[PDB]
Design a protein around this ligand. Sequence first.
Ligand SMILES: Oc1cc(-c2ncc3c(N4C[C@H]5CC[C@@H](C4)N5)nc(OC[C@@]45CCCN4C[C@H](F)C5)nc3c2F)c2ccccc2c1
Ligand SMILES: Nc1nc2c(ncn2[C@@H]2O[C@H](COP(=O)(O)OP(=O)(O)O)[C@@H](O)[C@H]2O)c(=O)[nH]1
Ligand SMILES: [Mg+2]
Length: 169
Amino acid sequence: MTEYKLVVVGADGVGKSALTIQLIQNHFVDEYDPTIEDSYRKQVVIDGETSLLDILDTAGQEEYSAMRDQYMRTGEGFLLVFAINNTKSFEDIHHYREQIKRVKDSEDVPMVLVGNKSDLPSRTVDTKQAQDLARSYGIPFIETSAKTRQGVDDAFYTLVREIRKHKEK
Ligand SMILES: Oc1cc(-c2ncc3c(N4C[C@H]5CC[C@@H](C4)N5)nc(OC[C@@]45CCCN4C[C@H](F)C5)nc3c2F)c2ccccc2c1
Ligand SMILES: Nc1nc2c(ncn2[C@@H]2O[C@H](COP(=O)(O)OP(=O)(O)O)[C@@H](O)[C@H]2O)c(=O)[nH]1
Ligand SMILES: [Mg+2]
């Protein structure tokens, strides 16, 4: 069966775990241990294709080791998640994108930019600013809310579609 290895990256607190648990369990977690990195599998049908999504929800200390490089390199596509009420998390997107390119040793890595927490009124990152960033990277931008589930399926399925495009090259 077709399988996709998806990796969810971004600053602490942006909603990586809540996005992952919504996709996998269809519920919103108000609290999920910030330090816990884990992986989950889900069988999905996307554009008629049955596949298994293996999703790594990243966490942990900031450390750079050969072992970490090697397991991040196994990801086939990456969600670059920031929160729309946290400018620093948007500023950190560049860093996560450069580290992914470093370990994949490629400029052409499937990615999707994800602006999460779209339900909150306190926005500090304008939608146009994030659309411009995604355009400069050549990747899709999706606004999500793990809380209301807006955009959650779209973010992950869009990443699968980006992987397919890559595999056709
Ligand atoms: O070997 C690696 C290690 C990594 C990696 N692991 C972990 C990282 C990390 N953690 C700390 C917090 C945030 C998420 C998790 C893991 N909890 N924090 C940052 O940066 C945080 C910032 C804020 C404070 C200063 N720093 C520099 C920049 F200002 C942003 N970067 C990381 C990184 F790059 C890889 C990441 C993606 C792809 C391949 C990778 C290979
Ligand atoms: N209002 C709202 N809160 C969210 C959303 N996503 C996550 N959160 C909350 O933001 C906090 C951090 O989420 P978490 O998934 O732990 O972030 P992570 O550190 O990136 O794994 C938790 O209290 C979540 O309940 C969202 O879309 N909207
Ligand atoms: Mg988490």
